[PDB]
Motif scaffolding. Structure first.
Motif, mmCIF file in Angstrom:
data_model
loop_
_atom_site.group_PDB
_atom_site.id
_atom_site.type_symbol
_atom_site.label_atom_id
_atom_site.label_comp_id
_atom_site.label_asym_id
_atom_site.label_seq_id
_atom_site.Cartn_x
_atom_site.Cartn_y
_atom_site.Cartn_z
ATOM 1 N N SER B 13 18.352 15.632 -35.936
ATOM 2 C CA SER B 13 17.956 14.592 -34.997
ATOM 3 C C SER B 13 16.538 14.111 -35.267
ATOM 4 O O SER B 13 15.611 14.891 -35.243
ATOM 5 N N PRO B 20 20.201 10.192 -36.624
ATOM 6 C CA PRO B 20 19.922 11.464 -37.298
ATOM 7 C C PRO B 20 20.093 11.388 -38.832
ATOM 8 O O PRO B 20 20.472 10.347 -39.364
ATOM 9 N N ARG B 75 26.614 13.374 -34.956
ATOM 10 C CA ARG B 75 25.523 12.828 -34.136
ATOM 11 C C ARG B 75 25.889 12.966 -32.646
ATOM 12 O O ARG B 75 25.014 13.173 -31.796
#
Lengths: 100, 269, 7
Positions: B13, B20, B75
């Motif tokens: 992240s 990310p 993500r």
């Protein structure tokens, strides 16, 4: 989270023979997190044309990467691998020793 | 010591500076064959081994397709994992997943493993029985319960046991000449001295393939560095022992490798 | 090659 300092190994692809093209390597491994800065140094200066393996990690989730550069060793030229990670108060610079 | 294929995914992240980071690289034994990088220019699954270059577009389009799904998934996970632990959107966090199959000397199934980890610790892992899971935190149990309701475990089992070993057997043959080859370690020893009453006897194993090898000293007090890759397919590793003086003859280094029928016992002489 | 569910 869990923090781990990288272990640094500066070595050549093939045995160091001055005058012969070879590759200088820096296999930084066992570190966590992934964000890390690795540069190979020649007589202190940064080496631009370096390449590195894609990020991969071991069984214990610690990462590992290999930073290679093509270099024709000389006897007076000193070489090193400078590494910086959230776990180092200063960028650990390990000198390339042809017998280690 | 037979054969395997394992994929490794890492999604980090980057708070405030975009989406990310995601890296999917595939390995067959100790040989990388494909990769994907969040921030690359191609944004497709790239070949990292010649035996893979031969694969048609439909394959590459295929893996690229599947790889980015792995991205969206990863993500979502980070966001979800931040919630469980009630973490601030401020800091960065890492998600890693790895799965694949192991195949014996006959190219028949041996094992499979999924398993995921958050911030460097195990989150949840598929049990060897490819039916159950090992949950780490109470949060990890959330994911386990959920996954058990959906029978995700049994959908993977079909992969590790089926399509994974198939595609693996296919990789081994297609790239046989590099994968199905071995390389006996090119060994040697050195003598360095620490002081005027101590010396570092070091034993080297170079240019070997695969990476598994056993470097052993014998007269407890032994430095062993982790097998590193030379960069040309072969691997290196060395072991050292601070030997007292004029006592180097009573020290033997021993090498064990798939490529050495009978071990190498090298002594400083 | 590859296979993933959300964690």
């Amino acid at each position: 989270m869990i923090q781990r300092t990288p272990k640094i190994q500066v070595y050549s692809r093939h045995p160091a023979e001055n005058g012969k093209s070879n590759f200088l390597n820096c296999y930084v491994s066992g570190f966590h997190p992934s964000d890390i800065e690795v540069d190979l140094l020649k007589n202190g200066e940064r080496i631009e044309k370096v390449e590195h393996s894609d990020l991969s990690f071991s069984k214990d989730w610690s990462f590992y990467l290999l930073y290679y550069t093509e270099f024709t060793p000389t006897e007076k030229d000193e070489y090193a691998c400078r590494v910086n990670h959230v776990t180092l108060s200063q960028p650990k610079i390990v000198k390339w020793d042809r017998d280690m | 010591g037979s054969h395997s294929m394992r994929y490794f995914f890492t999604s980090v992240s980057r708070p405030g500076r975009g989406e990310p980071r995601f890296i999917a690289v595939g390995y067959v034994d100790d040989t990388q064959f494909v990769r994907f990088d969040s921030d690359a220019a191609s944004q497709r699954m790239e070949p990292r081994a010649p035996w893979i270059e031969q694969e048609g577009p439909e394959y590459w389009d295929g893996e690229t397709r599947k790889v980015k799904a792995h991205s969206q998934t990863h993500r979502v996970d980070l966001g979800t994992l931040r919630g469980y632990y009630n973490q601030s959107e401020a800091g960065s966090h890492t998600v890693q997943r790895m799965y694949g199959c192991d195949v014996g000397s006959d190219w028949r199934f041996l094992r499979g493993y999924h398993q995921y980890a958050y911030d460097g610790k195990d989150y949840i892992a598929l049990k060897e029985d490819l039916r159950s899971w090992t949950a780490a935190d109470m949060a990890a149990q959330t994911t386990k319960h959920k996954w058990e309701a959906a029978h995700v475990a049994e959908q993977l089992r079909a992969y590790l046991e089926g399509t994974c070993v198939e595609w693996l057997r296919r990789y081994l043959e297609n790239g046989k000449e590099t994968l199905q080859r071995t390389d006996a370690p090119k060994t040697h020893m050195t003598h360095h001295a620490v002081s005027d009453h101590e010396a570092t006897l070091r034993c080297w194993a170079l240019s070997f393939y695969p990476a598994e090898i056993t470097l052993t000293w014998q007269r407890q007090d032994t430095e062993l560095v982790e097998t590193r890759p030379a960069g040309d397919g072969t691997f290196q590793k060395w072991a050292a022992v601070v030997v007292p003086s004029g006592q180097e003859q009573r020290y033997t280094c021993h090498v064990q490798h798939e490529g050495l029928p009978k071990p190498l016992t090298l002594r400083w002489e | 090659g590859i296979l993933v569910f959300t964690x």
